[PDB]
Point group: D3
Chain length 251, copies 6
Amino acid sequence: KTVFHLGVTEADLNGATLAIIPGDPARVQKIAELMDNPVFLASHREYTVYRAELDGQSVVVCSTGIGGPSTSIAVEELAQLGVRTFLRVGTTGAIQPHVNVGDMIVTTGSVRLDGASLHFAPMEFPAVPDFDVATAMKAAAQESGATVHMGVTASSDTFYPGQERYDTFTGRVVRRFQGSMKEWQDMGVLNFEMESATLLTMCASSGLKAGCVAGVIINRTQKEIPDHATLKETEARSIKVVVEAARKMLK
Amino acid sequence: KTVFHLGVTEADLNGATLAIIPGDPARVQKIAELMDNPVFLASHREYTVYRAELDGQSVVVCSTGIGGPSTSIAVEELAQLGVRTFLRVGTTGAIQPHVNVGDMIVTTGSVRLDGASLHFAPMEFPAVPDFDVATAMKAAAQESGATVHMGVTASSDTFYPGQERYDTFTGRVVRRFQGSMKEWQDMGVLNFEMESATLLTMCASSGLKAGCVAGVIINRTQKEIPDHATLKETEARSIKVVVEAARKMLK
Amino acid sequence: KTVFHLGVTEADLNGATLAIIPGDPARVQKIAELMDNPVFLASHREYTVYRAELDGQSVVVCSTGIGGPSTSIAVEELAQLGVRTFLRVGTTGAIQPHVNVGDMIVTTGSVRLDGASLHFAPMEFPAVPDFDVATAMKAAAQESGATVHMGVTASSDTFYPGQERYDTFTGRVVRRFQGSMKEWQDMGVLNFEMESATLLTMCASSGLKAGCVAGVIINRTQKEIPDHATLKETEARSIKVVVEAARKMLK
Amino acid sequence: TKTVFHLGVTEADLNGATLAIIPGDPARVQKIAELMDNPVFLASHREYTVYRAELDGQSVVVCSTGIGGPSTSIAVEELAQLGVRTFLRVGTTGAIQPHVNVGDMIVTTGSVRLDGASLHFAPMEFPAVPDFDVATAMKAAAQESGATVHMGVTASSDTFYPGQERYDTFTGRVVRRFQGSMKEWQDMGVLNFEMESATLLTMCASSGLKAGCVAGVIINRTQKEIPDHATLKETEARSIKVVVEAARKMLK
Amino acid sequence: KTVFHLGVTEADLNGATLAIIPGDPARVQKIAELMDNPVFLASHREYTVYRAELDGQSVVVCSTGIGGPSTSIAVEELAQLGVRTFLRVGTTGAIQPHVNVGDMIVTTGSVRLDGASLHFAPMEFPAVPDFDVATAMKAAAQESGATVHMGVTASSDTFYPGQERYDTFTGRVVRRFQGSMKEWQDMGVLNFEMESATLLTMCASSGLKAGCVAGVIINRTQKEIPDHATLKETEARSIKVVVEAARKMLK
Amino acid sequence: TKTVFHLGVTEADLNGATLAIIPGDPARVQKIAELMDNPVFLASHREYTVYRAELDGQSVVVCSTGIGGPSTSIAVEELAQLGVRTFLRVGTTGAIQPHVNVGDMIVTTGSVRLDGASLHFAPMEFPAVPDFDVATAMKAAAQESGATVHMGVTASSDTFYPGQERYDTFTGRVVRRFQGSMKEWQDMGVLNFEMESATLLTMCASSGLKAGCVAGVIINRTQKEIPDHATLKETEARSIKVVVEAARKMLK
Ligand SMILES: [Mg+2]
Ligand code: NA
Ligand code: NA
Ligand code: NA
């Protein structure tokens, strides 16, 4: 049996029960090649799927696309094929002045500024990671030598108005999001992204283990775009960290 | 300047003020080749971008990925580059017994079961198309010989629970969506999809003209696999119709 | 055999399946007299009911009163007596500078700033007209020689605070409505009125065909007071247009 | 001289009135006014019929509201622009509790806000409650008329049909929000449904205006008995007699 | 049967069907000693319980603690033991300039700025007192010679941000509550407290009779500080008044 | 020097404490304080009993909260004014999952916000989340005690009765919102019910304070509604030993 969107079967996964889920399809091969015997399985729409081996055990790498809706499809269909643990990796921009480019963020909870999380649990339910995944990500990030921040991420269904950007076609932000960035800053939120609220809510309410780790590639309060060397090193560290976190999760 | 995600410039669009926006990146070239002088511009993440010419005028074709969040990025960045009219095309499944495979649906309004629409307008605001775009889509659809339905579409941030699917890993649907498919059926809703609420709300509240047309490729109330020829013909007709609707909007 | 509020039976309607529904009881006779053989049927509370003949077919004219609640009663009771198509006519202000006194607006969707719409469908559902009624209204309005605007109407349960009027007894506007007129202006909304959200939501979710057309008699953004002659012409044109729209709907 | 936009009257037309009786039906306005002295028709436009009269020498307005919070909110606002500060709603109603009998009177102590226009004056958390002096005067007038009086909560709906959980309709459907709602209100002690009190009471309690509602019971949803015309006629007449006596107590 | 939190039995109550419910456990004995034969029953957590006799009838005095949650436990457990009428007494701060220190407020309805009221009735339901109890409280307060205000009270789940206090650890007030005190002032709200919305909603929806009376001990709009004698007199008058209101409720 | 408004203490009274242990019941404050060095009573007002003690040479406060978010929010605010930055909640809880046994410990990783006071600090979208170091210390302290420990989501209710879907009550009714809610939380993997963690965690996570919750299971709601009182005394004793050891780990 082949799932509707991902184009793979349970046999294709070789017994994997853990997936690493980047957003960008072009990063899938790069993550798989950090492990042993990487194998391309399928690519359709924003979903590129590889398998590889980590300490002898099969691991899936599957892209999600941008946003909760496309992420929710990938997580569901991988769970149909036996995956139980989901490690999100990416890079991100921080919104607090003490966070530096090259630091890592491990999300301990997300502000649910999305719609798909409500398709799994009502708004009162916390978008929080599994404690073992969060523990493994913190340990892998710390062992990398980076400075690590554990804290809250704001997870938005838009890149522009929901992150209170005004440098846009209309220059307008709807009332709900006017003043929102300052509010999140004053509440200690570390960063914005666009998938964690869906991922964490769907997994925490469905018997699946999930977490999110990200390397910081810009501080939005300072707007200092990194040189190429620093960007490359931060991107590389983020995926090396997520693979070591997967290693810590294997049983 | 090059826009942040799509990787194209205003010059690359060569004057285009109208975009055709399918979901799947692999459909972009297939739409572009119905027009004159198609040229590939860029491909990043779920976003593949071509230009072409229709009756001497430039037209962009840009994929959106699945879901309102990735759609909202593409629409905003194309608008930054001068695009003012957005024609969504795709194929869909219907939820009314009287709608047959091969028929076309032109959306007159969407049920906002998404999150990104709320980043542009509060829930009270109607997710409705531009009337000229809807009229052009109806005319083009009828001129193709298909049976056309004008009506309401339910636009969900998930494929599974928000469309009241129970054939899933948990088999559960949150309270909000229990009994929902029958509620929408009794309210005359024609079909589910995953992008129109975001697209139509964002455009109608932002000075952009938008509409949606889709070919019906399955009927969820019927238990019948369509033949391959009928599916191919319906896909081909959907994109012929959207290009003819673009020709009507330009003229 | 009589419905509870309107005081008419199905036999009194002489087979009519289409109603013209103004708000003011005193306008019912005026609209009826534009058609053939007008006959007074009943008057109770805000509900004055006539019948007339248009191209040989019976048409009902029934006032609604101000607001969604009284409107919802008239629509339901007429539907119980066999009416399936409802054409709302009136006159309105406008909130966009480009809309002039004497122009006409055909609503493509309503902002649901009412309560009664929620008694038919949850807020996510679009308050949108039937496409054939909106098309007939656009055609009748344009054929009259008026400048016609197709677009979104804000439909408020109040005349005063929900339209952000400060020339009131308290001069207070509740937080929800502070700044709201500029927000709707920036979102492209054309006008305020007080019944379309209820009408359009109720009908679109209940298998009834509805639409709304209005003549513009004042513009909130303009200082010039309209010539009383232009007001009289606009009132007369509005009802001539809705009768022609009814002619185009007859089968 | 300028007239208010919908009601078609000026402050001078009211002869100093600071109290209004506000029925829903325009045809009941003259019937209330004639219980007082020197009733005079002022205007009729749309659902708004307006009379003045005198009670113990003081001017009183009588003005219909139409059905629903939206048309009611217009009448209250425009009357308040002309100096009216106290608003007494009267009408007749069904009841949803078995202990409330036809011919009894209900004085609303608070309303379930199943409307929209109340939200245009105060967020949902705000209570739709009457002025305590108005409710007190209504209770005293009702008791002095010989009727059995019930003080309690009224459910105030923007619809007559689905919001009152009626299924005998064109579609036969009731939206999810209102499925099971009649039994829910019954178990919470709610006495009756009507269609204007949540708007009226929220608008007035948040705007420095005094308001209350009294109604004669003319049917009981929970009963099958059909009241005859003399009983309905008696209940309608008593309801307006009671509201005029309540106005007298407010003016004293 | 011994109720779980309050630690009393029906026999301990000696037939009482009326309770006076202050917030502070230390005030229970003081209230009981205004009546005949005061007897300590139990003390656990924030719940101190006495019985006394008033005109020969048993009355309970039971503290609630601060907040709707602890109040809801006390009311429920007393109702299990036969109590049907609940008279809340306390002292409060007023937010209207015309309300003076030493005046008394009888609540005619509460703004539901709490959470526990929603555990008994949806937000649309009015947090309103029983009319007999409010009438008895008005009469007792007026007969004492105090100036009495009947009106709306804002009932907050917090002492600090929900009363728009900025003199706090963070100085932050969440968006919902920014500007809120001026909005309640403009709406004619008399005072803030922290239990009435829960108490009134719970009782009104559960067949129990409840009301609230308070003496004003501070006014947030007035700079002048009240003297010690005025405060001691106001605290003493508040409890004398509630006992006289209980007398008026006995049957 | 001024005392805080409700707690009746000054910063000097706390001897520089930056960590508080916050039980609900005033009578348990002394029981926790006596597990540390040099316990001293500071104040008692309303439901707030406050002691100071010393742990490995560092000052620690113990302060009761009362039942519910509203009284808890006062105590946390006023302790934070006096320099407290870390808050360790200890208490008992009712488990809702069948695999959790009486006497097990639960460390909350996030709370379902079935309260009102959390909304006075952050909108509903914001996660009621503990500080990660506090949750890590609580888990380690609970494991080191020999207890079986569960990490997971807690449903945090403003009521004991209907919001925890209890039916053995005066009316026997539960409002629509909460009908079927316990099964819904069970199917979503929620471990337990209590009444303060949503307020505590949301207020601290949005205000620069570190907080966590640990609780001993005294009842399993898949079995019964009201708990039994033998290992309960034993469960309470182990829970407070665990929270003191978690405090030691946070101070190290
Ligand atoms: Mg730096
Ligand atoms: Na996507
Ligand atoms: Na009306
Ligand atoms: Na308490």
